[PDB]
């Protein structure tokens, strides 16, 4: 096809949750615009102090005069970005809507228990798992806080619209996470939205983006639960991102 000139601003909003293969849509969504795609992993190694940006505006989220100064603030969050996915951008998906009214929107899902299960390995292990430990010892190499914990349950919480959250709960987990996607499902307009499974590749995303399929490049599979346990253990036993991260290079 054609080259032409695409606009530097969120075209494509992805509304599904963590661990839906969110990282592997960054990837695939950056191979088509040659510019970066909001995720969890740009704020941990490119943006830790957007932390608490999103803190206060998921603290302010529940509030028209008010909305602008949040929309404003979300705007200029995405500044610069074409997409966005994961947490904690994944619960504004109806705000993101309104303020880039162009933008298509996306949700990635897959079955309800493998979403479960990686959850536990990666983001949200129960409370007396001796894994969650080792985690937490390797976000501390990375300079990760309990203040980006606070953001991974509150916008937890703000996408599943709770007020709190039994976190160490697998029942209430899996009830919100079936709850969160057929919500999605009955609030996008069929025309502006496109489910993507885990395994559908590149053709009908790039079908419903009119862009051909990236030459030669086959669809991105990264960060995998085993993944980002040899991750974890590496962070461990180096002590510091750059002494590894060559280790590590669709993932970071
Ligand atoms: N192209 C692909 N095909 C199959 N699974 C994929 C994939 N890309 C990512 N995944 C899976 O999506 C999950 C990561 O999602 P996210 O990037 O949103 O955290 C991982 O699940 P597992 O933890 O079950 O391996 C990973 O294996
Ligand atoms: O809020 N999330 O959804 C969310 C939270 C985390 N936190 C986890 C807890 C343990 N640590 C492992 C690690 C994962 C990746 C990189 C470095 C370290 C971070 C990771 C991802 C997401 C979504 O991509």
Same mark, same amino acid.
């Given at each position: 096809?054609?080259?032409?000139?695409?606009?530097?601003?969120?075209? +494509?909003?992805?509304?599904?949750?963590?661990? &839906?293969?969110?990282?592997?849509?960054?990837?695939?969504?950056?191979?088509?615009?040659?510019?970066?795609?909001?995720?969890?992993? /740009?704020?941990?190694?490119?943006?830790?102090?957007?932390?608490?940006?999103?803190?206060?505006?998921?603290?302010?989220?529940?509030?028209?005069?008010?909305?602008?100064?949040?929309?404003?603030? %979300?705007?200029? %969050?995405?500044?610069?970005?074409?997409?966005?996915?994961?947490?904690?951008?994944?619960?504004?998906?109806?705000?993101? =809507?309104?303020?880039?009214?162009?933008?298509?929107?996306?949700? &990635?899902?897959?079955?309800?228990?493998?979403?479960?299960?990686?959850?536990?390995?990666? +983001?949200?292990?129960? @409370?007396?798992?001796?894994?969650?430990?080792?985690? /937490?010892?390797?976000?501390?190499?990375?300079?990760?806080?309990?203040?980006?914990?606070? %953001?991974? /349950?509150? @916008?937890?919480? #703000?996408? #599943?619209?709770?007020?709190?959250?039994? #976190?160490?709960?697998? *029942? +209430?987990?899996?009830?919100?996470?079936?709850?969160?996607?057929?919500?999605? *499902? /009955?609030?996008?307009?069929?025309?502006?939205?496109?489910?993507?499974? %885990?395994?559908?590749?590149?053709?009908?995303?790039?079908?419903?983006?009119?862009?051909?399929?990236?030459?030669?490049?086959?669809?991105?599979? +990264?960060? @995998?639960?085993?993944? =980002?346990?040899?991750?974890?253990?590496?962070?461990?036993?180096?002590?510091?991102?750059?002494?590894?991260?060559?280790? #590590?290079?669709?993932?970071?």
């Amino acid at each position: 096809g054609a080259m032409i000139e695409s606009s530097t601003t969120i075209q +494509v909003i992805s509304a599904g949750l963590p661990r &839906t293969g969110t990282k592997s849509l960054k990837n695939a969504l950056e191979i088509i615009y040659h510019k970066p795609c909001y995720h969890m992993f /740009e704020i941990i190694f490119n943006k830790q102090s957007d932390i608490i940006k999103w803190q206060n505006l998921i603290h302010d989220s529940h509030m028209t005069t008010k909305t602008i100064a949040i929309y404003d603030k %979300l705007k200029e %969050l995405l500044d610069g970005y074409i997409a966005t996915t994961d947490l904690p951008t994944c619960g504004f998906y109806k705000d993101l =809507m309104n303020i880039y009214p162009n933008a298509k929107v996306l949700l &990635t899902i897959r079955d309800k228990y493998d979403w479960l299960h990686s959850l536990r390995k990666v +983001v949200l292990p129960k @409370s007396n798992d001796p894994w969650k430990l080792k985690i /937490e010892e390797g976000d501390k190499v990375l300079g990760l806080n309990s203040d980006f914990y606070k %953001l991974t /349950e509150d @916008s937890l919480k #703000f996408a #599943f619209q709770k007020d709190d959250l039994n #976190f160490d709960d697998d *029942q +209430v987990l899996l009830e919100c996470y079936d709850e969160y996607n057929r919500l999605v *499902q /009955e609030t996008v307009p069929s025309d502006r939205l496109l489910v993507l499974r %885990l395994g559908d590749g590149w053709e009908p995303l790039c079908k419903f983006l009119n862009v051909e399929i990236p030459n030669g490049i086959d669809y991105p599979c +990264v960060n @995998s639960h085993h993944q =980002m346990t040899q991750l974890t253990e590496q962070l461990i036993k180096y002590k510091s991102l750059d002494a590894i991260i060559h280790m #590590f290079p669709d993932l970071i």
